[PDB]
Design a protein around this ligand. Structure first.
Ligand SMILES: Nc1cc(Oc2ccc(Nc3ncccc3C(=O)Nc3ccc(F)cc3F)cc2F)ccn1
Length: 293
């Protein structure tokens, strides 16, 4: 029901349209089944002959056009996201069958959390601070466009062949579906999200990086995180996290949202901490965090 969509959404999608002849979706090759949204390996033909590797996001399909319109908006939101540290949109493919297809450049190393969790990987303090800095650069760009992420976490950050981090997003009044453990105090209490609350999320993301992907607050039930935080608590300093990086995390977790550093200041501060390291310090996984979900 393409005509019942929205003429402005349809014209915006038209400028990023992919013809069904120039895209081959390998439905047998799944890049994570996820939930009610699937990602597959894809081949895209660019201009002439070019056989580029891509990720194709789908699913499919209950409400008349409501979920299709939201799906197309999420993809169209990426149009002006051109920054080395933010995931790009190759385009959108309109299937003459069912669900429209969102086409993204392939990220060889997948998500940042599974990458750092992998025990065959040997990151140093510098590499992990490096990833945090790249996320800060991407967020600095997004904040300058007044774009509020709402779900910044290592699981939503993508890693390519050159190890360049691409900030991305994989995918109800009082009902729970929210990433409460990455959420700012004000966002848990009121349900409002700002750049300052993304700064809180970024601090948790730095914690995930320094612990090599440990789940935040393991002992704490999702429903009582506000009660836990208000007792006067923050995540402990990871074993391999340098003191000035911990101090930056505590600044991201400032109880006054307006007292939190901006992403521009975080880029500056983290870039200085990063420059002091040479790649000597190896980061090992914590035994108390292994197999902890
Ligand atoms: N192996 C691999 C796996 C991949 O999976 C995906 C990861 C993220 C998205 N993300 C999206 N899918 C559809 C619409 C928008 C986004 C998205 O990330 N938007 C977005 C970008 C930057 C932001 F700050 C916020 C956002 F919401 C899609 C994938 F297929 C992809 C590649 N390589």
């Amino acid at each position: 029901d393409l005509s019942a969509l929205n003429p402005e959404l349809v014209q915006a999608v038209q400028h990023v349209v992919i013809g069904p002849s120039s895209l081959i979706v390998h439905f047998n090759e799944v890049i994570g089944r996820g939930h009610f949204g699937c990602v597959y390996h894809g081949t895209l033909l660019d201009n002439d002959g070019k056989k580029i590797h891509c990720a194709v996001k789908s699913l499919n399909r209950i409400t008349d056009i409501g979920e299709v319109s939201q799906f197309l908006t999420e993809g169209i939101i990426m149009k002006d996201f051109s920054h080395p540290n933010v995931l790009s949109l190759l385009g959108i493919c309109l299937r003459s069958e069912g669900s429209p297809l969102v086409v993204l450049p392939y990220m060889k190393h997948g998500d940042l959390r599974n990458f750092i969790r992998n025990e065959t990987h040997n990151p140093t303090v510098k590499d992990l601070i490096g990833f945090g800095l790249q996320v800060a650069k991407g967020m600095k760009f997004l904040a300058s466009k007044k774009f509020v992420h709402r779900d910044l976490a290592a699981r939503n950050c993508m890693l390519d062949e050159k190890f360049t981090v691409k900030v991305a997003d994989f995918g109800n009044k009082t009902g729970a579906k929210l990433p409460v453990k990455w959420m700012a105090l004000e966002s848990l209490q009121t349900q409002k999200f700002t750049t300052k609350s993304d700064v809180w999320s970024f601090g948790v993301l730095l914690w995930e990086l320094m612990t090599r992907g440990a789940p935040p607050y393991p002992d704490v039930n999702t429903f009582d995180i506000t009660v836990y935080l208000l007792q006067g608590r923050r995540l402990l300093q990871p074993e391999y996290c340098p003191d000035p990086l911990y101090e930056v995390m505590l600044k991201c977790w400032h109880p006054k949202a307006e007292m939190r550093p901006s992403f521009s200041e975080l880029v500056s501060r983290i870039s200085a901490i990063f420059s002091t390291f040479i790649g000597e310090h190896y980061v090992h996984v914590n035994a108390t965090y292994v197999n902890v979900k």
